Amino acid sequence: LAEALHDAL
Ligand SMILES: [Co+2]
């Protein structure tokens, strides 16, 4: 999750 969001943002 943390990484996925880091990228999406
Ligand atoms: Co990434």
Ligand 1 centroid to residue 5 C-alpha, Å = 8
SS3 content of the chain, % helix, strand, coil (to 5): 80, 0, 20
Ligand 1 centroid to residue 8 C-alpha, Å = 9
d(CA 1, CA 8): 10
Enumerate residues 6+ apart whose C-beta is below 8 A from 4: none
Experimental method used, please? X-ray
d(CA 7, CA 1): 10
Ligand 1 centroid to residue 9 C-alpha, Å = 11
d(CA 9, CA 7): 5
10 Å CB burial of residue 6 (0-12, 13-18, 19+) is exposed
The alpha carbon of residue 3 and the mean position of all alpha carbons in its chain are separated, in whole angstroms, by: 4
d(CA 4, CA 9): 9
Resolution of the PDB structure in angstroms: 0.9
**DSSP alpha helix (H) spans, the chain:** 2-8
Ligand 1 centroid to residue 1 C-alpha, Å = 10
**Backbone angle region of 2, left / alpha / beta, with phi > 0 → left and psi within -120 to 50 → alpha:** alpha
